[PDB]
C-alpha cells in the first residue's frame, strides 16, 4: 500500500497470538509494544526520546505480522503509550518513505 500521512499511520499487527493496533514509526529505531507476555528469554533495556527514558524488556527473534506481512526481529515490551513498529521491522516489510 501507499499510506498518506494526514492521520497517524496505524495498522493491525499480530504478535504473541494477539491482534493489536500499532503506529508505523520511522522515528523509532526499535519496535516497542505495550505490556504483554512473550515466550523465551529477555533482558532489560532503557529506551529514550521526548520526555526521557523508559525501562523495557528486550525479546529477540520474535515473529510479528504487520498489516499482513510477516517479519522477525527484536521486540521491546514496556509502558509505551502507543504500540510502535520501528525501523528494525519496517525494513523487513520493505517500507520506504517517498516524496
Q: In this structure, what C-alpha cell is assigned to residue 74?
A: 527484536
Q: Does 67 bind Cl ion (CB under 5 A)?
A: yes
Answer with the entry of a second copy, Cl ion, none that 73 interacts with (C-beta below 5 to 8 A by kind): Cl ion
Answer with the entry of a second copy, Cl ion, none that 74 interacts with (C-beta below 5 to 8 A by kind): Cl ion
* 31 to 6, 47, 62, 89: CA distances (angstroms): 22, 11, 11, 7
Q: In this structure, what C-alpha cell is assigned to residue 24?
A: 508505523
Stretch that binds Cl ion, among 8-16, 17-25, 35-43, 44-52 (CB under 5 A): 8-16
Q: Find all residues with CB under 8 Å of 4, minimum gap 6, and list them.
A: none
Stretch that binds a second copy, among 12-20, 33-41, 57-65, 76-84 (CB under 8 A): 76-84
Amino acid at each position: 500500500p501507499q499510506i498518506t500521512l494526514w492521520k497517524r499511520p496505524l495498522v493491525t499487527i499480530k504478535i504473541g497470538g494477539q491482534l493489536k493496533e500499532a503506529l508505523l514509526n520511522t522515528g523509532a529505531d526499535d519496535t516497542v509494544i505495550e505490556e504483554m507476555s512473550l515466550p523465551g528469554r529477555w533482558k532489560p533495556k532503557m529506551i529514550g526520546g521526548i520526555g526521557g527514558f523508559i525501562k523495557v524488556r528486550q525479546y529477540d527473534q520474535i515473529i510479528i505480522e504487520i498489516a499482513g506481512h510477516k517479519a522477525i526481529g527484536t521486540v521491546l515490551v514496556g509502558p509505551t503509550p502507543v504500540n510502535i513498529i520501528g525501523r528494525n521491522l519496517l525494513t523487513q516489510i520493505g517500507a520506504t518513505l517517498n516524496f
